[PDB]
Amino acid sequence: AIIKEFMRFKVHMEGSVNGHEFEIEGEGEGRPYEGTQTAKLKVTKGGPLPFAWDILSPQFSKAYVKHPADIPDYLKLSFPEGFKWERVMNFEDGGVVTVTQDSSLQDGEFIYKVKLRGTNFPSDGPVMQKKTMGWEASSERMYPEDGALKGEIKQRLKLKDGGHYDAEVKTTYKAKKPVQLPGAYNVNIKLDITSHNEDYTIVEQYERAEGRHSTGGMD
């Protein structure tokens, strides 16, 4: 019941990428049981960003994943206390993004606090040269480990002039209170930039995420 069928969120990110510091604030909304959400993000410090928006976009909401009835929605069940998540992204050219995130519920809205560290992107690479064009649809493979929910992704960023720039991603999602963990399953995710201004100081995103059985789908 805590998770309403229409939910808003507020997000704050403090970050560095290759030592360039910045802050982002944003608001979002969606339908947690339908797996759909939008967000409006604004660069509040360190803009215009001297790197690709796309490395930040996946850091702005796993309460909004559509789950089959027989897969426990661990992250929805974590509320009202909520959950933390930690992420590592290894990009194929040696760029690294590490993220920590706190997700809570205050005034009937989700509150997201994000800390991001991006390092070792090549000065001539597509991230620092802003040559990326959004993520391909992803499958996150989910499994329980060490009393937390883990997910692994082979994520693909489209490039200007064609082809892709890959990232291996691993995330740990941990409820602040003990709730029922699921077995192994997959989450199909598509994240779109729906609008941006010229220098990506103002960006709107849309994400659809649907959990699917990895065993006994029953086709």
Domains and CATH numbers, the chain: 7-212 (2.40.155.10)
Assigned token pair, 17: 């990428």
Which of 195, 99, 218, 106 shows the shortest CA–CA distance to 151? 99
Q: Resolution in angstroms, to 1 decimal, for this deposition?
A: 1.7
CA distance 147 to 194: 36
Q: Distance of CA 161 to CAs 132, 165, 193, 200, Å?
A: 10, 12, 19, 20
- Give 3-state DSSP helix, strand, coil % of the chain, rounded to 5: 5, 55, 40
Assigned token pair, 102: 């706190």
- Experimental method, per PDB record: X-ray
H or E stretch including 130?
Answer: none
Q: Vertex 149, ends 55 and 89: CA angle to 5°?
A: 20
Number of H helices, E strands in the chain: 1, 12
- Compute φ and ψ for 170, nearest 5 degrees: -135, 135
Q: Vertex 34, ends 29 and 35: CA angle to 5°?
A: 65
